[PDB]
Amino acid sequence: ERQKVCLDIIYKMMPKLKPVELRELLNPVVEFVSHPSTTCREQMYNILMWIHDNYRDPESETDNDSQEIFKLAKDVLIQGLIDENPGLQLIIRNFWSHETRLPSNTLDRLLALNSLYSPKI
Numbered sequence: 001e002r003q004k005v006c007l008d009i010i011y012k013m014m015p016k017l018k019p020v021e022l023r024e025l026l027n028p029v030v031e032f033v034s035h036p037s038t039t040c041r042e043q044m045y046n047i048l049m050w051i052h053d054n055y056r057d058p059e060s061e062t063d064n065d066s067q068e069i070f071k072l073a074k075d076v077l078i079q080g081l082i083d084e085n086p087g088l089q090l091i092i093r094n095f096w097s098h099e100t101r102l103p104s105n106t107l108d109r110l111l112a113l114n115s116l117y118s119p120k121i
Helices: 002-012 019-029 038-054 069-077 089-096 107-112
Strands: none
Touching (some): 019 038, 019 069, 038 069, 038 089
16 A cells, blocks of 8 residues: 555656656666556556656757656557456557557558567567
8 A cells, every 4th residue: 555655646747857867766666567456567567658648758868867867768658558457558559559659550560560579568
């Protein structure tokens, strides 16, 4: 219960934090891929779905933590496709299977499909 409530507060206090400290708080969040009690793992896959969407940073190229935690939130949003609880992964499939995150010309999709490899899967 402590680890559900302490994730529900950190989902609330994201859009005020500077990236000097979100990198510090993101190091123990993304260790929750080896956790039972599927509701807390749902919370952990729900805050990264915002981190990746609001730290996409379309070619600003001024900071390095803002392009490092996008890497570290790619590296768990990929590994959350083999989770041992079906029904939950359909959410992540509908997430990755949408336009502006993977195109719909099918040759663009075949070219893009090598980017999301990540040899954990």
